[PDB]
Amino acid sequence: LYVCDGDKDCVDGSDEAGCVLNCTSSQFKCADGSSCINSRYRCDGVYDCKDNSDEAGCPTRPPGMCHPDEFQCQGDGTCIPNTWECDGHPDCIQGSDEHNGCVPKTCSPSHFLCDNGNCIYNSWVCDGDN
Amino acid sequence: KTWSAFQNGTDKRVVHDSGLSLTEMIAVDWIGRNIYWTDYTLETIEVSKIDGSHRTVLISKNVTKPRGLALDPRMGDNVMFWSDWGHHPRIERASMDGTMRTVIVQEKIYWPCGLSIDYPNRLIYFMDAYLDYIEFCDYDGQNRRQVIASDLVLHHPHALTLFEDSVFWTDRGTHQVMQANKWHGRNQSVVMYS
Amino acid sequence: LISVRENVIFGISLDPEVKSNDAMVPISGIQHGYDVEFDDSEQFIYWVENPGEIHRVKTDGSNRTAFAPLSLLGSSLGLALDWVSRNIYYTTPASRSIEVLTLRGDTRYGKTLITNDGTPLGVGFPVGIAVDPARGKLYWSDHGTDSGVPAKIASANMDGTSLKILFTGNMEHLEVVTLDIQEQKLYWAVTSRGVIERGNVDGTERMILVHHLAHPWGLVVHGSFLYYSDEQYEVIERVDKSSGSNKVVFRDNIPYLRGLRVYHHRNAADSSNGCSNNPNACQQICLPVPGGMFSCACASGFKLSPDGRSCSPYNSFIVVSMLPAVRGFSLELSDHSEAMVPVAGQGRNVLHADVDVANGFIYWCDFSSSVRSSNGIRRIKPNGSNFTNIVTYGIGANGIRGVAVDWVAGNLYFTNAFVYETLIEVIRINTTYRRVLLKVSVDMPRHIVVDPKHRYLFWADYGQKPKIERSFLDCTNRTVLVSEGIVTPRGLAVDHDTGYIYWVDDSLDIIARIHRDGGESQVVRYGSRYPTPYGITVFGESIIWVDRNLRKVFQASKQPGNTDPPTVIRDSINLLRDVTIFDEHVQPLSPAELNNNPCLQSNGGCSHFCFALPELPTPKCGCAFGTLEDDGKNCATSREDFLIYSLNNSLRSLHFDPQDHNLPFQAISVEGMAIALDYDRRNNRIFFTQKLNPIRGQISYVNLYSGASSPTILLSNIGVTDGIAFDWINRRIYYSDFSNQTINSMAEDGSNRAVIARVSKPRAIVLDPCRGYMYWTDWGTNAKIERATLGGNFRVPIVNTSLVWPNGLTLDLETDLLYWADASLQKIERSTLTGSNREVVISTAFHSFGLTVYGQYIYWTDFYTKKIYRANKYDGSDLIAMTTRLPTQPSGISTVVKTQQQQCSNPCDQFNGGCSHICAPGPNGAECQCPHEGSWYLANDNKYCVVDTGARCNQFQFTCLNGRCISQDWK
Amino acid sequence: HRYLFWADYGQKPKIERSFLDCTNRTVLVSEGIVTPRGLAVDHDTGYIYWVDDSLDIIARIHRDGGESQVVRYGSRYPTPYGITVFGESIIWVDRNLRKVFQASKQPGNTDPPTVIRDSINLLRDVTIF
Ligand SMILES: *[C@@H]1O[C@H](CO)[C@@H](O[C@@H]2O[C@H](CO)[C@@H](O)[C@H](O)[C@H]2NC(C)=O)[C@H](O)[C@H]1NC(C)=O
Ligand SMILES: *[C@@H]1O[C@H](CO)[C@@H](O)[C@H](O)[C@H]1NC(C)=O
Ligand SMILES: *[C@@H]1O[C@H](CO)[C@@H](O)[C@H](O)[C@H]1NC(C)=O
Ligand SMILES: *[C@@H]1O[C@H](CO)[C@@H](O)[C@H](O)[C@H]1NC(C)=O
Ligand SMILES: *[C@@H]1O[C@H](CO)[C@@H](O)[C@H](O)[C@H]1NC(C)=O
Ligand SMILES: *[C@@H]1O[C@H](CO)[C@@H](O)[C@H](O)[C@H]1NC(C)=O
Ligand SMILES: *[C@@H]1O[C@H](CO)[C@@H](O)[C@H](O)[C@H]1NC(C)=O
Ligand SMILES: *[C@@H]1O[C@H](CO)[C@@H](O)[C@H](O)[C@H]1NC(C)=O
Ligand SMILES: *[C@@H]1O[C@H](CO)[C@@H](O)[C@H](O)[C@H]1NC(C)=O
Ligand SMILES: *[C@@H]1O[C@H](CO)[C@@H](O)[C@H](O)[C@H]1NC(C)=O
Ligand SMILES: *[C@@H]1O[C@H](CO)[C@@H](O)[C@H](O)[C@H]1NC(C)=O
Ligand SMILES: *[C@@H]1O[C@H](CO)[C@@H](O)[C@H](O)[C@H]1NC(C)=O
Ligand SMILES: *[C@@H]1O[C@H](CO)[C@H](O)[C@H](O)[C@H]1NC(C)=O
Ligand SMILES: *[C@@H]1O[C@H](CO)[C@H](O)[C@H](O)[C@H]1NC(C)=O
Ligand SMILES: [Ca+2]
Ligand SMILES: [Ca+2]
Ligand SMILES: [Ca+2]
Ligand SMILES: [Ca+2]
Ligand SMILES: [Ca+2]
Ligand SMILES: [Ca+2]
């Protein structure tokens, strides 16, 4: 079942390398020509095709899904605290948190700022945990 | 819905109807013949008979957002553990009947995404998708260590399992299943690709 | 207290500091949660989903079901329950109606109390419903429509006979209305302004009680308190019923909030009404009315009698089909009452309806491109008492496009549309007997109709060059009645009185009739006055048809040339698709009315199928499986022929009849693992392929008729061979090797060996000796099925796309069809020898090693389930397992057929018998002929012909077309 | 009648009526037209007739629109390509039958037609002088 599904189930993809690329019925198509994939997947939240274009067409979700203290992820349909939105780390599965222009957030004196552009409480700076 | 089948795909049957949330965990008792599951929309932890014939809601007073559930049903332990993602994210432990409740970890949890138990050592293993770590502690949370912690190895973990001296987890950000050594992570392998 | 959210229903204890949320076992899995209602006398809770369905579950979780799935059209928006009369009331906007249903006992009774009637009092878009049983009053809230129905709060009687409007104005986007039985007061909320209002059941007073909200779902009143929920504020809270000035909050930050109910032991003795006082006083439905009196009403498909106690079922009505539902209309156009319980619900896409009036059944077909379960044929009774699925397995990619019913033979005929092919099949209405009568290839039969009086079957074709065709009940004859003047025949109907055929076309915009014997075409109601006639039926001196654009049902006189303005039966019907009639007159049963049809009595004695043939006084019989017997009525399954398979060592035999558990020959055991088998009619002998260890392949033959002779061996050590094929015309054996990537040929005794071709992983070989072709399967890179001559001198891929892991291959010489199995795509596919047509036979629960075809069935063996399976080779319409779970993983399968053509009956088929031109049919064996015009001459043997002068060249050469000779080595 | 009429062959084919200076446009037939190969007008009655080889029909309408009427429909008229009106008769040509036919213009009549010339190849239009 696995030897032709668009999923490289092993290190070198020996399974998928042998398959044809003609987009049989119900197979949604992707611009990279990697593999044609079943239409049901189009808006489930998984980048099923290599160039991120299965879901690219899909519409946006109901905005009432999350509380005012939260931000919403379009691909996953999950809610994360507002502070996380532009902290500089992609928290949503598809990166919906870092959007457009963030007006970059900065670190206050009660916290410390490290190599990866993250802000951490001063007590954590040296306690045994990275 | 929740379904039960044999390891060869036969005898597919329905245990009970289930919540639509993507964040859900199921636990089974090989002794008590009971099944436990978490509900993310109703914010509840529920127990039933393994055949689904009887159903009850067991914990509802403070489980804001369950993201993990693990059980130890041995005669001398009889303990249940679960994790919550409220504004005060924590890991909580309660008697398997809910008559006793305690909070085990609450100082650095920010996005709990995994809960598993190690019975010989009587240890809990949990995963965090914000600080990107895999960490284990004991049933009281008084002993705690970190197995893997880095933005390079853990991107978006969702489930954790343990076997022998190895820990297995799943990552949605890399579409992969990973194996590592549960004590120091100095061994890393990919179990399933794509 | 009970609260609803779009995905959950849960219960709160009624004191505000008890924060537990499990006063009842919750209801998980809801998709589009809407209002809820409860019944305490049976511990039941009911909820509605919009978009969705009406469901009931028990407070302890013991039971969960869908309560009105077949009559509900669209989605309901409000529920009300009467515990005194034991009736439930629900409101549906898709049909602009308010309906009542009876909870008493296992037999549902349901009618529509209020709908559109042109007056503003009538129901518009009813969203909310509340009922009072003791006073026999019903209240509803409705957004109104463009018919002049205002946004209103309205009052009616629970029997539906009285209508009045209580409140109007300042009402936009009103969602719920609720009633208080002690105060006799009504409460409703408005989203356009964020306020909750109170009113009196007589319309005497209106007041405002809550002042600042944003989309407040739900109102409930119990004792001194009123409870409401708000979406944007995510809160559920309680307020003083008498003041509105003080508030308490039960829960907060709850999303997707919906309406609320309160649960307590309300009792019928206190709330008693006329129906409770007079049990059993109505045959179907009892509805209370003011003054303690009661009224009786009949369910859909029934009418009421002057005694008021009894109801009688409709026996003469018209049936109309619309993509979303099937409905019935009385012949009396003054009667707008439902003549049958409607058919509506999820998955409905009705294309055609047909009726068996004598048995009391209606049969309809559903067709959806996007949903498997929606496609099929199903039958229901007008009373809704019975529902059954007649055809749900073996449906083509394009679905079922036509259903015809024969009430004399008790037969159903339908058309099944695959990708490049269409099939016409007949099924006996109450038995598991289904057969395919015709394969149509390029024509696309969709609409089908049958006439038992004239013993004719008619269908319409929708492909290129559309036409109408006539056939006999067994499809053994094909004739075309209309070729010219057809573009889009949306509907086909036959008249059983005159034996005339009528069709409608929305491209031509015409209704036209022809005679069963063809000839002159005639025109009815042509012109722009008929924009889109989609369905037509004939009854008496009238024709009845439906129009998709005018949204109307019309009646006119069937005689051509008449131009009386038509007659109308129903207005404002959406998505009309077909019309049918349910009346004893349209389906006669007297022999004089049916021209002495032989199947009218005891199915003509036929075992499987009975088919009246025009001008044949005796019945005709057809078998769904096997063959027909000299008695002319019964069928047999050729016990002279059997199936042979190997488990590992044990060669075993099986019978085509799954009930005939006898073994054709007892079981035989061989060394190692037997993997592939082939049989020959000449010797009553089997050739089998043997694996001794993971490295050693072996070939051996065994004899069945030679007493009990043990095996004989042809080759002792070769790579592991997985496929074997036999050629009885040339007396050769062909085998494939997996360890050596090769396909080799040998002679019957092994003394001669040759190698035909090389392909990676050559699992299967198939042979046709009379045509000189062999086929093989390669599952390596560029997985393909390939064809070559018996000698491998010519080679071409028959299938090289949409194929991944071909591991089984078989050929059928009766149909000239090739079948293969794919383990990656888990499916069985059939095509022609050229690969020009491709269809899928099986796509579900599929694992297979071998493949063989006999009769109307295809058989395969499965190693995962350790079973052998039989299916129908054209559509997989049947699936059964011929054996219990076998002891060990099956191997490849072959068939033992004694009627094999041991010699080629048409010798010219072997590449023109070797010729270039016209081949004579075996005068002295195969023989050759040139064109009779021009001085041609026969050469090489009596074979090539392009020699216009008889020119001479030496015999040691070979002599070509165009008059040239060349040394044989170059040949 | 001071009218100008033309037929349209694109998507949603129709027949239109106009004034001699085309300052007015009106549509007489929209439904029931697929391939109007020929259009003719009767100068006596002020009626318009058209022929269609897809519909295989001869049909007439009134200069003020309204009710459509049918003449010689059916398979007996495989490909009427051109039509003209003269007196109480209509004359039309058929591409497949290779014939010229004369019939009476009033609808509903079914007298067998009359033939004028046989074996004429590639017939396209008929006119009267
Ligand atoms: C097929 O089975 C149905 C259901 O058993 C038969 O339906 C009965 O038909 C008789 C008349 O022949 C009625 O009087 C009964 O009321 C029907 N029973 C039910 C339960 O509906 C039907 O006769 C059988 N044969 C056919 C051709 O439908
Ligand atoms: C590829 O698919 C198209 C349909 O999308 C089909 O028409 C064509 O024949 C296919 N090509 C091959 C080589 O099968
Ligand atoms: C549960 O909630 C109560 C009341 O809000 C609080 O006092 C208690 O600390 C909470 N317990 C936990 C484990 O969060
Ligand atoms: C673990 O990793 C080390 C290298 O870090 C390697 O030498 C060793 O063989 C590994 N052990 C196992 C059991 O994989
Ligand atoms: C409800 O479930 C029980 C479970 O045993 C079953 O016996 C019963 O038939 C079901 N239906 C009704 C109406 O009780
Ligand atoms: C359905 O039909 C069967 C027999 O065909 C009958 O026994 C049964 O009562 C029917 N169903 C109902 C609800 O009457
Ligand atoms: C079948 O049709 C042919 C003409 O197509 C006709 O001659 C023949 O009589 C028909 N069969 C029977 C049994 O009448
Ligand atoms: C056939 O299979 C059984 C187990 O399925 C095995 O024990 C037996 O040895 C096999 N036959 C031979 C000849 O090895
Ligand atoms: C495979 O083929 C070669 C010749 O191509 C032959 O020598 C050998 O015996 C065959 N069988 C095996 C098992 O290699
Ligand atoms: C597939 O077969 C066609 C002819 O049927 C041929 O032209 C084509 O090149 C083949 N493609 C492959 C990949 O074998
Ligand atoms: C699957 O396992 C069940 C027992 O758990 C058994 O009854 C069944 O035969 C098994 N099926 C197969 C195909 O192994
Ligand atoms: C032009 O046509 C319109 C309708 O389209 C009509 O009302 C008007 O009278 C016509 N022009 C003249 C001058 O009559
Ligand atoms: C996305 O869709 C939602 C509804 O699903 C809302 O319409 C919202 O306004 C939409 N637009 C954007 C850009 O979020
Ligand atoms: C960073 O952000 C904080 C608020 O979180 C303060 O605005 C601070 O002044 C900022 N620092 C810089 C350098 O802009
Ligand atoms: Ca794969
Ligand atoms: Ca996807
Ligand atoms: Ca972020
Ligand atoms: Ca630290
Ligand atoms: Ca039309
Ligand atoms: Ca034509």
Would the CB atoms of C28 and B18 count as touching at under 8 Å? Answer: yes
Task: Please state the φ and ψ torsions of residue A52, each to the nearest 5 degrees.
Answer: 55, 40
Q: Which of C859, C842, C840 is nearest to C897 (CA)?
A: C859
Interface contacts (C, D; CB < 8 Å): 59
Closest atom of ligand 5 relative to the C62 alpha carbon? 2
Q: Of the candidates C167, C7, C176, which has an alpha carbon nearest to the alpha carbon of residue C79?
A: C176
CB-based burial label for C425 (10 Å; 0-12, 13-18, 19+): buried
SS3 label, residue C357: coil
Atom 8, ligand 10: residue with shortest CA distance: C800
DSSP state, C299?
P
Distance in angstroms (rounded) separating the CA atoms of residues C612 and C308: 47
Residue C962 gets the label, from left (phi > 0), alpha (psi -120 to 50) or beta, of: left
Residues in chain C closer than 8 A to B56 (CB atoms): 22, 25
Ligand 11 atom 7 nearest Cα: B10
Separation CA A127–CA D83 (nearest Å): 101
Q: How many C-beta neighbours within 10 Å does residue C725 have? A: 24
Contact of A101 with chain C, judged by CB distance below 8 Å, is answered with no
Q: Are C429 and C599 in contact (CB under 8 A)?
A: no
Question: How far from C188 is each of B115, C141, C605, D118, CA to CA, in Å?
Answer: 47, 8, 68, 83
How many Cα atoms occupy the beta-carbon half-sphere of C887 within 13 Å?
7
Cα separation, C595 vs C455, in Å, equals 9
**Whole-angstrom distance, CA of residue B123 vs CA of residue B141:** 9
Contact C256, C244 (CB under 8 A): no
Of C433, C417, C416, nearest in space to C425 by CA: C416
Other CB atoms closer than 10 Å to residue C169's CB: what's the count?
8
State whether residue C802 sits within 8 Å of chain A by CB: yes
Query: Cβ contact (<8 Å) for C487 and D74?
Result: no
Q: Work out the minimum CA distance from C5 to partner chain B, whole angstroms.
A: 10
> How far is the C-alpha of B107 from the C-alpha of B85, rounded, in Å?
13
Cα separation, C880 vs C835, in Å, equals 28
Would an 8 Å CB–CB cutoff place C256 in contact with chain A?
yes
Residue C591 CA, ligand 1 centroid: distance in Å: 21
Minimal-distance CA residue of chain B relative to C845: B9
Tell me which chain B residues have a C-beta less than 8 angstroms from the C-beta of C7.
19-20, 41
Are the CB atoms for C50 and C76 separated by under 8 Å? yes
* Surface-to-core class of residue C458, CB atoms within 10 Å of its CB (0-12 exposed, 13-18 middle, 19+ buried): buried
A6-41 per-residue burial string, b: 16 or more CB within 10 A, e: under 16: bbbeeeeeebbeebeeeeeeeebebeeeebbbeeeb
Instruction: Name the closest-CA residue to atom 6, ligand 5.
Output: C63
User: Two tokens at C962?
Assistant: 């165009």
Chain-centroid distance of CA A111 in Å reads 28
Among C28, C826, C866, C885, the strongest candidate for a mutation testing the B interface, having the largest count of B CBs within 10 A, is C28
Q: Ligand 2: distance of its center to the CA of A21 in Å? A: 10
What is the whole-number distance in angstroms between the Cα of residue A122 and the centre of ligand 18? 9
B26 alpha-carbon distance from chain centroid: 8
Count the neighbouring beta carbons within 10 Å of the beta carbon of residue A68. 7
How far apart are the C-alpha atoms of D92 and C460, rounded to whole Å?
30
The contacts of residue A7 (CB under 8 Å, 6+ apart) are A15, A16, B194
- For residue C92, give every residue at least 6 positions away whose Cβ sits within 8 Å of its Cβ, in sequence order, or none: C72, C73, C74, C75, C76, C77, C98, C99, C126
CB-CB neighbors (< 8 A) of B173 in chain A: 93
A14 sits in which H/E element: helix A14-17
Q: Which of C496, C608, C505 is closest to C548 using CA atoms?
A: C505
Q: By the 8 A CB rule, do C141 and C128 touch?
A: yes
Tell me if B57 and C27 make a contact (CB, 8 A cut-off).
no
* DSSP helix/strand/coil, C307: coil
Which chains reach chain D with 3 or more Cβ–Cβ distances below 8 angstroms? Answer: C
| Strand ranges in C837-907 using DSSP code E only, listed in sequence order | 838-842, 851-854, 857-862, 867-872, 879-881, 893-896
Ligand closest to Cα of A117 equals: 17
> In the numeric block, which tokens belong to residue C830?
């059939």
The answer to whether the CB of C495 falls within 8 A of the CB of C515 is: no
| Coil, helix or strand at residue A122 | helix
Ligand 3 mean position, distance from CA B61 (Å)? 8
A70 is in an annotated binding site: no
In C, minimum Cα distance to D30 occurs at C528
Is residue A54 marked as binding? yes
CB-nearest to C7 from B1, B41, B56 is B41
For residue C528, what is the nearest residue in chain D, using CA coordinates? D31
Residue C178, classed as helix, strand or coil, is strand
Residue at C209: amino acid letter: L
C969, burial (CB in 10 Å: exposed 0-12, middle 13-18, buried 19+): exposed
C858 neighbors C845 (Cβ within 8 angstroms) = no
Strands C399-406, D36-42: pairing kind:
unpaired
Phi first, then psi, for residue C374 (nearest 5°) are -65, -30
Report the nearest-CA residue for atom 1 of ligand 6: C386
Supply C729's token pair.
Answer: 């015309």
Chain A contact for B156 (CB, 8 A cutoff): yes
Q: Is C272 helix (H, G, I), strand (E, B) or coil?
A: coil
| End-to-end alpha carbon distance in chain B | 27
Angle at Cα B185 formed by Cα B182 and Cα B187, nearest 5°?
110
**CA R_g for chain C:** 37
Ligand 13 atom with minimal separation from the A61 CA: 5
Interface mutation vs chain C, best among D14, D28, D75, most C CBs within 10 Å: D75
Q: How far is CA A120 from the centre of its chain?
A: 24
8 Å CB contact of A4 and C824:
yes
The 8 Å CB, 24+ separation contacts for C442-447 are: C443/C467, C443/C469, C444/C417, C445/C401, C445/C402, C445/C415, C445/C469, C446/C401, C446/C402, C446/C415, C446/C417, C447/C352, C447/C401, C447/C402, C447/C415, C447/C489, C447/C490, C447/C491, C447/C492
Which pair of structure tokens corresponds to residue D95? 């591409």
**Tokens representing residue B39 in the block:** 């509900």
**Alpha carbons C456 and C439: distance in angstroms, whole number:** 18
- At a CB cut-off of 8 Å and minimum separation 6, what does C74 contact? C92, C93, C94, C95, C324, C344
Closest atom of ligand 8 to C887 CA is 5
- Whether C848 and C820 have beta carbons less than 8 Å apart is answered as no
Residue pair C75/C31 in contact (Cβ under 8 Å)? The answer is no
Contact assignment for C781 to A1 by CB distance below 8 Å:
no
CA gap B152, A116 in Å, rounded: 12
The arrangement of strands across the sheet holding C185-190 comes to C174-180, C185-190, C195-200, C206-210
Nearest Cα residue in chain C from D74 = C521
Q: Is A85 annotated as a binding residue?
A: no
Whole-number Å distance between alpha carbons of C483 and C489:
11
Ligand 4 atom closest to residue B186's alpha carbon, by position in its atom list: 5
**How many Å apart are CA C442 and CA C467, to the nearest integer?**
12
What is the distance between the alpha carbons of residues C340 and C299, in angstroms, rounded to a whole number?
9
Distance C673 CA to ligand 8 centre (A): 8
DSSP states along C439-504: E-TTS-EEEEEEETTTTEEEEEE-SSS--EEEE-TTS--EEEEE-TT-S-EEEEEEETTTTEEEEE
Cβ–Cβ below 8 Å for C31 and B17: no
For this PDB entry, the determination method is cryo-EM
A40 φ/ψ angles, rounded to the nearest 5 degrees? -55, -35
Q: How many residues does chain C have?
A: 971
From the CB coordinates, do chains A and D have 3 or more pairs under 8 Å? no
Q: Is A129 known as a binding-site position?
A: no
C826 touches chain A (CB under 8 A): yes
Nearest to C377 by CA among C367, C388, C387, C391: C391
- Minimal CA separation from D86 to chain C, in Å: 24
Round to whole Å and give the CA distance between C317 and C328.
6
- Identity (one letter) of the amino acid at C600? L
CB contact under 8 A, B57 and C25: yes
The answer to the question of whether A55 is labelled as a binding residue is yes
Restricting to C residues 11-40, those with a Cβ less than 8 Å away from any Cβ of B are 19-22, 25-29, 31
Q: Are the beta carbons of C801 and A67 separated by less than 8 Å?
A: no
Q: Which residue's CA lies nearest to atom 1 of ligand 2?
A: A22
Among protein residues, the one with the nearest Cα to ligand 3's atom 10 is B62
Q: C8 and B43: CB-CB below 8 Å? A: no
Among chain A, residues having any CB pair with chain B shorter than 8 Å are 7-11, 69, 76-78, 80, 84, 89, 91, 93, 116, 124, 129-130
C45 CB-near residues (< 8 Å, 6+ apart): C2, C9, C24, C27, C36, C37, C38, C39, C56, C57, C58, C59, C263
